[PDB]
Amino acid sequence: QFAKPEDAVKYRQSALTLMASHFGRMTPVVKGQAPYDAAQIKANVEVLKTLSALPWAAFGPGTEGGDARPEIWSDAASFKQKQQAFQDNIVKLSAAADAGDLDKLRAAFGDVGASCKACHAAYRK
Template sequence: MTIRPTSFALAAFAGFALLAACGSGDAPAASVDAETAALPLSNGMTAAETIDARQTHLKAVGKAFKTISDGLKESEPDMAALQAAAASVPAETATMADWFPDGSGPASGVKTDALPVIWEARADFDSKMADFTAAAATLDTAAQAGDIPAITEAFKATGATCKACHQTYRADD
């Protein structure tokens, strides 16, 4: 039987990968080759596309939160601005459940602040996303009603759901 150098290299790579997987878990994730990084995840996008999309949506949510926060500090808040910002939060996060498919964490080789614990404690993470979604809907309802005290309370509650998730599941906070 003739062993081809390519077959040997693939076998050696597989062996090293297996050894790395059995390690202590303290080693940084190996870089992912371009072919692997280009494979579609369960949401139909690559890891890079998924991470870029979720970061884009979350930055938009952050911008909306800033608008609401700044508006609530005014003696005469711009209700139209508050309503538009509050409405944008559930709109931006409508597909949030699809933003964290397996393969879109740090092990993908793509820079992300999402911690691996998201995929290790998925039920808790999903519960926290559901809490945020419900709070965002309440915030939007309060804003559309034009009730500043209700908007203030709903904004605090929505922010608390963000914080609860970020404390455990996001780096760089």
């Protein structure tokens, strides 16, 4: 869907910005600093689930740029592993949010965050 590589960069950066907002806005809730409304978090995680599937299609062949390391493309299987692991952890977060269980939400949220950090370390400049 991208006329030039730059367009893919702009898309993924926006997707990741949104993803990050929908994840990080739950921090005060998982820490207990903000109240836990199970329905609010369920709805928010549903949005996060949608967003978290979006960035990966915008790292297609030839879309090198932004802060993406070139190893995303030359190690495609390893990058794909990190993104599928992250998405699998999003599935676990969805299950916790759907269950309305603050303890499971906290644990699942920590797993997601670690998946973000792991891909960041390997694949972001």
